[model samples]
Target: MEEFHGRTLHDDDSCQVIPVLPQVMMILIPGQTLPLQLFHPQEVSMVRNLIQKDRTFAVLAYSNVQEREAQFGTTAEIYAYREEQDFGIEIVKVKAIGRQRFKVLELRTQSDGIQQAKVQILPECVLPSTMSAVQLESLNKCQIFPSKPVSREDQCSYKWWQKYQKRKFHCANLTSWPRWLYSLYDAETLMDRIKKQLREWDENLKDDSLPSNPIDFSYRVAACLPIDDVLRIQLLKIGSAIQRLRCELDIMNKCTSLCCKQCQETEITTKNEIFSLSETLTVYKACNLNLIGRPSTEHSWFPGYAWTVAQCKICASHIGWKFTATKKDMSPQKFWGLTRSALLPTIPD
Candidate 1:
């Protein structure tokens, strides 16, 4: 591609320039699709022109621009567009690093007062390709299992191992622990120390914001808070540290349930070995037990043992039953069902 600096195109130029009005600043990587809703009258006309001409536009990152001057913008191709009444929203797919950069050469105002620019093209930028697999892997694993138990030594070791791996999963990078928990101290405690430090950090954040009477950080630390992709995308759009922290604190305070299934505040029964009826179903799913053909309300009869009423039908069994490693005895069979203890490598005495 030819680079355009200052000179206006002589007459017959091979490349064409299109204009865009960006509401949100973003860097669109190559092969990435961005969905945007446009509301401005002049910009709506710009989309109409693009549709007519079968051309693409540049999406700039600048928040402020002079009425007549053009700021930085990325070249993007429109793949699809839809009209919601008189306004037009577009879906565009753009590549990040093309062979060259383009400069806005001229600005033209539509009759309705929307601004469009004629841009000059420059040579594509070439970046180094030395990004390693190991480094990416470490960052990815860290994001995935951010709260996994590990010693300081193990943490350091794993960090280096991940640098060697070189693949960071984008999904894991967007996810995070909602809150930290209080820690227990012991002489040889590795996991407890990390949790304690996280707790202290959370406390420091809460204390620091007291004068402003800002949002509470403590209540947001629960592990049971639900997160969805839309929320993740909104969080990803936050560019500043204070803004990000404030967003997290707000989300934590608003969420109602913070307890996971195991920590649920309910009565645990010896008969069902579950805190609740929902928990009883979770046990069956985790073990992959066969309950497909059977009805959820069936009651089994047993002799020589108390006929215990289970919180859920699948967990119902005779009380004080002998534990068996095989299906012959209910208690022992369920215990050894998924986790095979006998197959584990024996430790030296």
Candidate 2:
């Protein structure tokens, strides 16, 4: 509990040349679990070799082949694996957890021909006494959640944010009951709001395993929230917990409808339906989609749940899945899984 906030795999060591894995379909968020399967023998051998060493690799959050590699990335530590010599499809079944956030200093091809990066480890927003001399200057800043784009309506929030950024905090006298408890966007208020939302979603999450740290809580929100993929990466780039929570509140305001990514105008479901079955898999209460094929329990994310293929009704695009309980005792009983990539962010007009 006393550890530094932005502590990295490198222990806040700035630039260290490390191995990198470039993935196209996904992005890793810190405090989240990442389970992956590697089919290629080259990557398998790479993981095998990595096991002898640090067992840490940088997951370069990438998409759009036309675009260049992402500047920001997350370090992942391989904790568990099984070397299954499968027929062809599956090979090294490995599970890892997302660690530190880093910035690329240099990227070059290794002699083995895969990419390796000289990376600058970016830290989270830390406290006063715990922070070092170097840490003070290295805060990762991003636009507050509500402040983005240019519109007649955007101007009001933008102006307020700008003013808030310019506004100074009051220097209250120390040696008191309340320790640093005041802001225009009070973090306690934001945290309470999120707790309330979580409680409304499911009673189990409000007390059980939610994060105590504001920084961790903010990252958990980033991981679990049904925001855009690009916006998820943006949240990763942000350093301040207060800003993330504030930004999330704004994004929550805009997440009224879940529309088809293929047919942008096609409405699939309402945002009110989002719920978490696990960290990576998000389940919706209902979606405007048809279920295809019989439900299968084959490697279901939740042991008691059976997964069925779910698709968008109009566009015929893949929405996600309908997970039903194998055991009737499961709380949700039945639900829909709509990954962030399957649907586009739609602002209610």
Candidate 3:
């Protein structure tokens, strides 16, 4: 336990009060780190005070860009920083690392021009001892077949199905975990299958380690899922690993069920051209996407592919980009690339 400006803080404590900063533009989930630049005189002063006292503050996302407060946020501590002068303006560049999730219980403004909040740190999601038994029984009841055929019409390929079944069988006898929790022993069950599919869709996902701790595992998966800020907050708020996993599975199923974000259109396009990004992440010419707006010149992380911002026609949210094939005779003249954040999963009926 440590004392920060008269308030006591513990590593494992929940529901404790803390200082909050409502200036961040993005949501910071646990296990993720963010770098922030503090330039405003008031904001810089508050951070300096924090560094001298607690070295921690809650970072809340703006409910609306125009709004001044947020209901939920993550508690962050300074990792590193340095002072620099930029064109006569004093700038404090700080690297902040997320610690825990918190909810704002009350809000107030201080005389120092800083925002203060009575916030409660949320408990981490965890698996109960009883859940292990329940899961094991669920797995036992699930009959694994050699060829439980999944439709090719589905976004997943036959190879994925085969790999899933193989892992399912292997997990059934894996003794490292409790007998009841064998179904979720590894990234082989329903949740893992969905995650695998998503990884295939987004090549940028490089983290493959699955933690043994249920709470850490849940947040790890949550951090990797390509959902938006709203959905990510919802996941962080869920206190049960089982419930969170179920919700994630539901999201994946919904995404697959509705290939296109808007229009309820088909997943496949008419063209057979393929869009490649410097021998990495490729987008098929005939893929599910609804392009919007005019093509604008933009640079991309993947070299050799030019980017034009695009949005989902139905929701009118930024999906990803429309990339024109830079290489001659590349078959696909152009293709729309959609981001997971812009795609909304349909609610199960």
Best prediction by lDDT = 2
Tens digits of per-residue lDDT for model 2 on 2-111?
11123235757578778776442467888788878877767878887876566777877764446657677888777777787767654876677777888877778788
**lDDT tens digits, residue span 213-316, model 1:** 11122112211124543454344344332354446555533433212222233212221332221101112212212222322222323222222222212332
TM-score of each model, in listed order: 0.28, 0.58, 0.57
| lDDT (Cα, 0-100) at 98 in candidate 1 | 20
TM-score of 1: 0.28
Better model by TM-score, 1 or 2?
Answer: 2
Candidate 3: Cα lDDT at 33: 76
Clashes (backbone N, CA, C under 3 Å), per candidate, total 23, 2, 2
Task: Identify the superior model by TM-score, candidate 2 or candidate 3.
Answer: 2
Task: Encode model 3's per-residue lDDT on 1-349: one tens digit a residue.
Answer: 1223333245554455655664676878777878888788878777788888778878877566677668777888887767787898878887777777778878787777767787777776454433234245546544455654544265456576556545445444544544336445333364455556555444443234556455666677777665667787777677677777767776655543323445444343321233443322345543445566554445565444566766555455555677765667664566555554433334333
lDDT of each: 0.35, 0.66, 0.60
Q: Which prediction has the highest TM-score against the true structure?
A: 2
Model 1: CA > 4 A from native: 1-15, 22-34, 39-42, 61-68, 86-101, 110-112, 121-124, 127-349
Q: Best to worst by lDDT, what's the order?
A: 2, 3, 1
